[PDB]
Design a protein around this ligand. Sequence first.
Ligand code: ES7
Length: 282
Amino acid sequence: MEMEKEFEQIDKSGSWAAIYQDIRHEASDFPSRVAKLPKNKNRNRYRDVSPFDHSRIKLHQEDNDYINASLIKMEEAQRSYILTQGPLPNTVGHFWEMVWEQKSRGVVMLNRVMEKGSLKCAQYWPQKEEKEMIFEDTNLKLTLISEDIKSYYTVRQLELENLTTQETREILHFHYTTWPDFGVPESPASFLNFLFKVRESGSLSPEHGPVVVHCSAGIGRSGTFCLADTCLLLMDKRKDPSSVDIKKVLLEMRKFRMGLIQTADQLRFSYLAVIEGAKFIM
Ligand SMILES: Cn1c(N)nc2ccccc21
């Protein structure tokens, strides 16, 4: 079926939970043996969220190459994304090592450091220009260059230096700051505006490594971001845009990371975002 009328048909029939459970039933199951080794217990935020072995990002280290991060490679859309958990106190150095080694331009953050009165990820970037961060385990230096605070999101320019080679690179930090503690946003307008800002920066484009996107676990809000982007790109590329099947795209992405889209409300919000976004594109 088309998207917008399939949408109204699920709303009128109140069957979002059944649609979402079908997706969960049909989703791929691949091994994640490296994530479950005992030496990696303190490298995982949640015991039921792990990268598959076949798609996990490997750190360029001989001691322990593990990080909780997956490469999502969308072949027809010609887009790639790295989805990862919010960094932990003992993995902030690993995080910036991955950004360096994979040649990423942008980092997309979809959570606040504290939500619901608890810490959802480490404070992994510097908050003042004159107070830079040094990660001694991975030999990197990170400096805040500028910050632009808007009503729904903040964009930061960062400098990442590899202290071993003295090479430097500019990283863009796109921080969506207004996703509600509970539930999903009522309108997709600010989320779409944010996606378009990431796009306009060049961070999603083939001349750079894959964008790094995270929330707390790296599957819920993160999944929404890449699902909406990929669906809108396919609607532009194809002769028949109504052929784009958001459930099929989601199942394809779930071949690369488990659990993408965590609730039926997130599923409905993804439909809403693609629907409204398709109108603005033209
Ligand atoms: C899961 N986890 C949390 N929540 N805090 C951590 C600190 C160190 C290592 C692991 C941690």
